Design a protein around this ligand. Structure first.
Ligand SMILES: *[C@H](CCC(=O)O)CC[C@@H](*)CCC(=O)O
Ligand SMILES: *[C@H](CCC(=O)O)CC[C@@H](*)CCC(=O)O
Ligand SMILES: *[C@H](CCC(=O)O)CC[C@@H](*)CCC(=O)O
Ligand SMILES: *[C@H](CCC(=O)O)CC[C@H](*)CCC(=O)O
Ligand SMILES: *[C@H](CCC(=O)O)CC[C@H](*)CCC(=O)O
Ligand SMILES: *[C@H](CCC(=O)O)CC[C@H](*)CCC(=O)O
Ligand SMILES: [Mg+2]
Ligand SMILES: [Mg+2]
Ligand SMILES: [Mg+2]
Ligand SMILES: [Mg+2]
Ligand SMILES: [Mg+2]
Ligand SMILES: [Mg+2]
Ligand SMILES: [Zn+2]
Ligand SMILES: [Zn+2]
Ligand SMILES: [Zn+2]
Ligand SMILES: [Zn+2]
Ligand SMILES: [Zn+2]
Ligand SMILES: [Zn+2]
Lengths: 323, 323, 323, 323, 323, 323
């Protein structure tokens, strides 16, 4: 045949493929989500997320040291509340679970970058991400509370306040609140593009969010690509230090489009449902877990993500699979 | 607070979200991959693909009628061979499994759009997609054979010849051979950007591909986004009627980038590993299968895919979930 | 003051800066240029390149093993000739220095990616990169000879034929000659954009190029950015597998502009003058050598280079500074 | 051979190359950095920067007249302090070294465009670019001081206040301060994109900055190209009259990307380490200093810089190498 | 008022404006059009072009020496014919005026870059730029003759063959004829975008073009900007070494649009009508000639022209106004 | 010859050329500049602008009726002052020449769109466009006065206030001033991109501006294309209703670049020097005035101008050359 162009020439050997690989994945690209349950004794297994367990608050010092020894540079904290109410007020109490998870992490490992999930669905009796109303989740009532929670977590040592409530103006609210309390240097990792996904079931079981309905009046429609970009750019305008796309696995088109529309770092969340789909397919012997995990995380990097939130990070770190 | 812009305004009710949904998915967007096994009597369950089964050649006429009655408009045929050899020559036999699958489908439902998968990994003793040589898979020898296969599948009635061998210049070779044989109107559905993915294990089980090594010397590197675009644009230059990204699920950044680089239709293959990942977490109770399938297929459409190859297509049709 | 945007927030600690670093450099990005001198016994120090030495052909098998063991994946071969003449014909001798360098490397480390520098300035009595004529360097006569050289270097095992003669149509000539001789799978690493730079003095000393005038009638003008892009895009049109910008150091605007104009891999040559500039200020105590080398190579990667030709590569490998 | 396109046609002679040269370099493109040491008698040689010497304040009138007679249109002043303290308060004293270097230059040569380096690393006991804190260099404490120093240098006659502290909001601070003191016409040359480079060693020896640690908590990461663009555009937003990339030699990709993102003039700093690398390689006889200097400065122009800060400017001017 | 942005800041002095000037004009940018009349003894003044005169062929050797000594690097030759006929055949006579003008210039100043105007309007009895037929000017018959003219001007030493006949495919015809005759290195300066302008009256007077009608059936419509770009891009596709916009003065939007659509060098012809307009208002005392000429030529450079054909070039050179 | 593409096909006849002409010029595209001298009796001829005469204020009613009867839709007024002082205060007197020229025009012809030139160079003793200072023309002292003049001309009936002072923030100043006085509906035609051209000599003689020096500290440098765009976009930001490029003839590249950077209407001024160059070349019989005038104005339209200020408009209108 007559072909000047033969893409296969650079695919002949492992060495050639290595030399021409366009995207790299390292441990530094990973942020590890940790679930911490207050007022409890033993680690609790999360059924829907094989390998994942609620860390007892009294064992957090031990765990964050373990995580840090594995090479993990960062964690995103999620608390399981034993003090849920109507407005999730435990979250903004100077000594509530939110403040303490941060405090225990920063005090045990000063160099650990601690990102504090910032919401109310794990602390409200109804399970919704804010103050409920005859209306639904009240946007501006919630903004006030997010700002209050932001200040106590910032005071507790959190490096990033990561608003995941999907409230309009959330970044501005929190930016205004941190600044006024003297936390002008505390960064905001905004879950800027957060879809009303059906992939969060395993996470709600693990973080114990008591929601019976859905989050469609605040988390955005999965189908809306132009809206997804607008969501994140409104947060860049508001001062966010880092932007994010969640879920990440089935939204790589969003990640890539966003990368082309901002100079800001972009995080991407490999959600619980993705973790779950890989784990159960591997358990059924249908796929090779490690190859599938590396290809998955690699694609997220390829699409333009600077940071990836992944429940596989520790195992990848300890088993020296990523360095 | 004072916010003029409130994305949440159009999220208040199901009616508002329906009005403002940017992407829609119909039954028409789906192409159904079918496994046909010659010389057998009972349908065989594919263990790695819960719900999928090999159709006995003797029952193909009944199954294609069933699919057509469900409202499925197109299928992609894959055969399980009982006559494999070194070069997979049964594939270009005027009456081999490949020609017969097309013949039966088109004779049974003349309006059925039949896409014939065009390779050899299912017909070779070594399980590689072409002629093995001291070299590895010999590109040009395989081009010769792919052309011969093309003419007999077209001769049997295939509407599209779909090369999945990942050989350079495969679209040009198939186009010349078809035109020369008087099949200038037969279309080419090129598996233009086809990654050396770790997500095809379930498929190889279902199709009986006898491969011990890998396809890394022809299928392309998962990490190479620039190369991915170049792979499809080369096929556009050689005459493909339709391009394709495979896998789809973890490659929607690629689908989006390609959509913006061509005016040609783009197919996306929701591969066996993606199907198994959904099926197995649904069976373990971790996710809602239907919600996850529709969100996954919807994402593929949102990223820019015009057609989606999906194993869930017949259930979606029969359960009237998509019309 | 009141600033919402504070770039300094992600600069506070080594961990934060590591997380947000946009570019990374690995050992894999580097290609090692090697000088091999036939008919000699002792390694010769190149005075202008502190630390570099000509490898005796008799010791090449030992040095290529040493480089391969350091983890270097690829080399670019340069010979010092003891059999120079008017047309540099030893370069296309089935058993000349050029063929032998490749033969030895590939025989010794089969997995070594061997790029054979393809020119004549090291084999001609006049030191010009081709056939001298009343005219100057005769483009088309040199094209003929470059093709012949290509086939014998491919015949000896070179993985890439790297034309550095700066002759028009050199990639097309080399591609036709290779294909015709049955080397359709041999790749071309074109020195596509190669400037008539004043930074090659150390290299000419090390390679023994016997040139009294300059190369301004073939190598291109350092000031011509539009022409630079056009030079590489022409080579893309002629089939090059990889393009290149040489020198790299003072031409990262060119690397960036080319990166945005092609999907092809781009190499960048950190030339001898750049190496000498770093080596000599490091020896005078003016800078920290290691910090400067890594920042320089990192910049080349940041600008868009996929591969970097660098004389510092073996020290970087052995001192485990890059992996 | 058959080539319609022959790039070499316009390279045949010096006249042709001259006619088609795309980029030009003149003396007007150069700004000369001068080091002035107070309370001293003799010129002090800078070991790390051969040819460069600290000018005794009492000899500044003589030197700026010499510089101006050579054709140099502009200088950037750097003072060596004999009055260093905790906050570098000498810099904002109406008669401190900063104010006097400007005053002596503008009064001796009224047409000389004087740019005043605006920072504190040459005036602080610790050597850091601002007010130190338990925290590190205090951003907003430093902004106040930069504004105060800006007003006295502006009052002393400086044409450009050139903030090189790498503090967020620095341009706004200084713009606000000059305006309020009635210096609304005084321009700001912002070191808008200033990297935490390893190429400043020779400069710190010459300007005597007493820093033991590093500037990584304020000067930006060398590897971050998207961040580099954002840095400069934030300064355009803040009112800067001219933008700048420093270092310039190994950041030509940054210079070019920035040129494409703003209508503003862009300066580029050929730093001390670059000056040093060229001087020591030339001293070792490895390169031709003049050819290498002109090619270096030419590339900076080629990449998009309107002005170039260069320690070679005077010699280039006196030796009538550039006009 | 409160304005952060004050463009006036960099306009305060001649030194500041010199520093920030974005475009420069040198003697090197200019090409001098020369009129040579065979069989005459005295230089003839062109009334419509104050200052321009026809050079007697007998004095051409003296004038080309004069131009070369002024520092002019290139000329465009135009002959006044005493041997005109129906097809302008003296133009392709091995020893006709066209060949002789080149011969004399190149023999006298070998380094002179000689561009030979390539047409027939100066050699035909009817004054049209080619072969007249029942049809009008016959495109393909004129292509034949333009090729023959090309080879004899190249044979005489012309560095560039400049077709100004406005015939379709003229660059391809001239390129084939040159290559075939062994002139593969002769360049083509195509008058690629050449408008059917009303500004050539002075030129026709000076060149003696005997035309009674117009050139509207070959030269293009002044109003057609899309067509203008298409005209030059077609010549790029046919191999031109350099493109051109003629006239220049009232077409700088075209120059700018073309600059952004090609990487090729672009010439711009400051035509006779533009020269006469400047000369006559300068003579009537309405404008300052020198200031207007430099501003006009500067504008042409600012718009993107690499070379400018200008009748003012020798005065500019001799009066040392441009170097 | 073999040419699929023949641009000449659509040039064969006047009908074809007419059908495919891309740009049109009509009378509606023209605004006519008128000079009105107060306290005088007879029309005064402008020597430098043949055909142009100062209209005696007492004859303005007659002239604007004549102009309006010719089909002219608009005029730009310029007054010749008999009451010049230090600040040009006649311009903001409720009954000064500025207010009266507008009043007489709008009252005689209510439908006439009257644009009022808004500056001080025709009313200041020194001839500069504003309040002089030890500094030069005081920007903000001038802004106050421009606002005051804007209000009286707006009150006098002017439809457009056209600031031609080249003061920073001029549009904002005037927008603020008109709004506060209740002239929120009065439009601003900003001479947004106004170069320090050498083409205004004839205009200064006609409008009698007493300037001995130059306007280079406020009108912008002719060579600065990026600055030219920034000038106009700052005015769009400030609220200008229409933008403008002056001069227009030699700045068609600017006009085209601006057209691509804004949705705003763009005016272009065919200045006095252009008018003068065409008139004197025509008088000398060197060019055809009408063909040259139509081609000139046509090019300005072609480049992107919506409106053209032209001294030829009335003659073009009366002679029914444009309709
Ligand atoms: C290409 C890849 C199959 C393989 O490599 O085995 C042709 C079939 C694509 C679908 C595979 C799947 O669904 O996993
Ligand atoms: C091209 C230029 C070499 C020369 O002109 O002598 C091939 C080698 C590139 C590397 C030269 C270096 O490292 O200086
Ligand atoms: C093309 C047009 C000449 C014509 O049509 O007479 C070749 C010469 C261009 C320069 C003409 C001028 O300077 O007016
Ligand atoms: C976003 C929404 C979670 C929810 O429960 O709605 C904040 C946490 C994201 C992680 C979800 C996951 O991993 O599935
Ligand atoms: C920027 C930072 C200098 C430093 O010492 O950190 C201000 C001066 C730039 C010149 C540095 C050089 O020339 O090396
Ligand atoms: C702009 C500047 C005129 C000046 O005299 O500086 C306002 C009027 C423009 C018309 C000038 C002309 O027609 O030459
Ligand atoms: Mg939001
Ligand atoms: Mg392919
Ligand atoms: Mg080339
Ligand atoms: Mg900054
Ligand atoms: Mg043409
Ligand atoms: Mg302005
Ligand atoms: Zn929540
Ligand atoms: Zn296959
Ligand atoms: Zn060479
Ligand atoms: Zn500093
Ligand atoms: Zn002609
Ligand atoms: Zn004025």
């Amino acid at each position: 045949t007559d072909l000047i162009q033969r893409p296969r020439r650079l695919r002949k050997s492992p060495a050639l493929r290595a030399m021409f690989e366009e995207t790299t994945l390292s441990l530094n690209d990973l942020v590890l989500p940790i679930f911490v349950e207050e007022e409890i004794d033993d680690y609790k297994a999360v059924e829907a997320m094989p390998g994942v367990m609620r860390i007892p608050e009294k064992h957090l010092a031990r765990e964050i040291e373990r995580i840090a020894n594995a090479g993990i540079r960062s964690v995103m904290t999620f608390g399981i509340s034993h003090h849920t109410d109507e407005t999730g007020s435990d979250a903004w109490r100077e000594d509530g679970l939110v403040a303490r998870m941060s405090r225990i992490c920063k005090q045990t490992v000063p160099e650990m970058i601690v990102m504090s999930d910032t919401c109310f669905c794990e602390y409200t009796s109804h399970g919704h991400c804010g103050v409920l109303c005859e209306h639904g989740v009240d946007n501006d009532a919630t903004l006030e509370n997010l700002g209050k929670q932001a200040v106590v977590a910032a005071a507790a040592g959190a490096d990033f306040i990561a608003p995941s409530a999907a409230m309009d103006g959330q970044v501005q609210a929190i930016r205004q609140a941190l600044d006024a309390a003297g936390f002008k240097d505390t960064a905001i990792m905004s879950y800027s593009t957060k879809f009303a996904s059906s992939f969060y079931g395993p996470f709600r079981e693990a973080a114990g969010s008591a929601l019976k309905g859905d989050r469609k009046s605040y988390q955005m429609n999965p189908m809306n690509r132009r809206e997804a970009i607008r969501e994140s750019l409104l947060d860049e305008a508001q001062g966010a230090d880092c932007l994010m796309v969640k879920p990440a696995g089935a939204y790589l088109d969003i990640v890539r489009e966003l990368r082309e529309r901002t100079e800001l770092p972009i995080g991407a969340y490999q959600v619980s449902g993705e973790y779950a789909m890989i784990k159960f397919a591997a358990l059924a012997g249908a796929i090779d877990e490690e190859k599938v995990v590396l290809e998955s995380l690699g694609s997220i990097k390829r699409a333009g993500a600077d940071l990836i939130f992944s429940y596989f990070a520790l195992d990848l770190a300890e088993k020296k699979i990523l360095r």
